[PDB]
Amino acid sequence: WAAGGSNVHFGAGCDSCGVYPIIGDRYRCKDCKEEIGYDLCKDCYETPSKVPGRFNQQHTPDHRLELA
Amino acid sequence: WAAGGSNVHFGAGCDSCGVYPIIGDRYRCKDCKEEIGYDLCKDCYETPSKVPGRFNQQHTPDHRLELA
Numbered sequence: 001w002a003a004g005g006s007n008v009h010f011g012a013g014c015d016s017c018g019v020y021p022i023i024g025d026r027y028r029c030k031d032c033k034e035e036i037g038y039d040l041c042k043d044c045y046e047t048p049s050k051v052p053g054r055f056n057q058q059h060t061p062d063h064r065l066e067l068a
Numbered sequence: 069w070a071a072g073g074s075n076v077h078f079g080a081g082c083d084s085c086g087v088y089p090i091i092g093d094r095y096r097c098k099d100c101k102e103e104i105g106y107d108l109c110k111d112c113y114e115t116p117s118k119v120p121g122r123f124n125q126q127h128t129p130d131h132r133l134e135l136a
């Protein structure tokens with residue numbers, strides 16, 4: 001069972017703004033293969049933003065992001 | 069950034085024993101609704117034993133389960 005439901009993602013936090021839990025939609029990078037994952041909320045997804053990661057990930061603007 | 073993410077899944081709980089977070093391996097149903105998730109811990113997946121949540125109108129014995 002998903003924790004928090006479908007509008008609260010207690011299993012990840014935004015790498016750009018640090019929000020936790022991710023409220024709303026969640027976007028997850030499929031290119032960053034580091035174990036920690038790379039995730040962002042919608043606001044940070046929609047905003048042009050250079051955050052390479054919060055846990056020493058290597059996320060480049062060419063990386064692809066999908067929603068869960 | 070995913071919390072846990074290795075033997076700790078803060079985005080899911082077992083539908084069989086209600087444990088949360090699922091510590092250890094996590095099995096997720098691929099046939100149940102993408103929205104309404106169905107998850108199990110290792111113990112509940114491997115054990116052949118009735119629990120009151122072992123199958124429902126939504127999650128049915130033909131459903132397939134994958135590892136995370």
Ligand SMILES: [Zn+2]
Binds near residue numbers: 058059063
């Ligand atoms: Zn990335």
Ligand SMILES: [Zn+2]
Binds near residue numbers: 018044
């Ligand atoms: Zn954000």
Ligand SMILES: [Zn+2]
Binds near residue numbers: 098099106126127131
């Ligand atoms: Zn199912």
Ligand SMILES: [Zn+2]
Binds near residue numbers: 082086087110112113
């Ligand atoms: Zn269980």
